[PDB]
């Protein structure tokens, strides 16, 4: 009974990072080493655990969070990072246990003339808490002066399109990201690595 990771990794379209998606995985066998050894992934980093240890553990639930960012932002998907993505879009806890997986999606997510579907949040009053998801669309008040519903000096719309084009440099090309996190409850532990099956 293999975990349906394909539904996440091979989805036709991914979420915008500000509106990142979460898939719950349960009641299945996960081969984390097979994922780790896939040449399809250019980023594969685990925190608080390794793929070998995950192959020998059972969890109640696994969460697969997925979204698109630009290449030069991939380094922000890690504990203790700063930047617009870590601060305002998708935040991992300092004590994160899990894995960050990423791959270049230029062939899927860029379009001649721009793919404007993918957004990120450029401004926020405070930093996100870990695993917080903010889909609000109020004017960002950058200074002490209220905006009163009008954009202008220090009054900005908080979301921004990437506009991915295939001729962008790699730092500006789209990357698909999957973050795996792990939950243990006082309940049957139905997601296991192959060694603990």
């Amino acid at each position, epitope marked *: 009974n293999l975990c349906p990771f394909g539904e996440v990794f091979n989805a036709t379209r991914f979420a915008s990072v500000y509106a990142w998606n979460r898939k719950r995985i349960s009641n299945c066998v996960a081969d984390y080493s097979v994922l780790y050894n896939s040449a399809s992934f250019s*980023t594969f*980093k*685990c925190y608080g*655990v*390794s*793929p*070998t240890k995950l192959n020998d553990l059972c969890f109640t639930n696994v969460y697969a969070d997925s979204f698109v960012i630009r290449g030069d932002e*991939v*380094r922000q998907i*890690a504990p203790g990072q700063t930047g617009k993505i870590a601060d305002y879009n998708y935040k991992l806890p300092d004590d994160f246990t899990g894995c960050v997986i990423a791959w270049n999606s230029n062939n899927l997510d860029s379009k001649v003339g721009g793919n404007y579907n993918y957004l990120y949040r450029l401004f926020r009053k405070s930093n996100l808490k870990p695993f917080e998801r903010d889909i609000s669309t109020e004017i960002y008040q950058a200074g002490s002066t209220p905006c009163n519903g009008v954009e202008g000096f220090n009054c900005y719309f908080p979301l921004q399109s990437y506009g991915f084009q295939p001729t962008y440099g790699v730092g500006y090309q789209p990357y698909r990201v999957v973050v795996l996190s792990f939950e243990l409850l006082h309940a049957p532990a139905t997601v296991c690595g192959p060694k603990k099956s």
Partner: nanobody
Amino acid sequence: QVQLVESGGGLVQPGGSLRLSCAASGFTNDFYSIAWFRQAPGKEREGVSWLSVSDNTPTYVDSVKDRFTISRHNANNTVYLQMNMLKPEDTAIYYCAAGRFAGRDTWPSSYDYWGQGTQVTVSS
């Protein structure tokens, strides 16, 4: 506190061999990973090999697959890159880099710790 001490570079003919070393200190445990990046003239730093130290799992780009070997000696906390059947395209400054994670990344920006590069030249 974390320091990466690099050495082993120089000049060789095509087909020849070279052994680079990365001595890591300042880690409290084995939960870190090493990368080798190479920077050929007028290009970006490009990853060629990776070692996840806790799992002892190596990774290689397809172009160095059967020529390059990455390994660690526990005793001296040193990771080695054995480069055999060297070719002119392998000429570059070679960096080792470390991160506090189990795994691998193509992005130099994902590695917080860096050796001083060593020059590798393959010519006749």
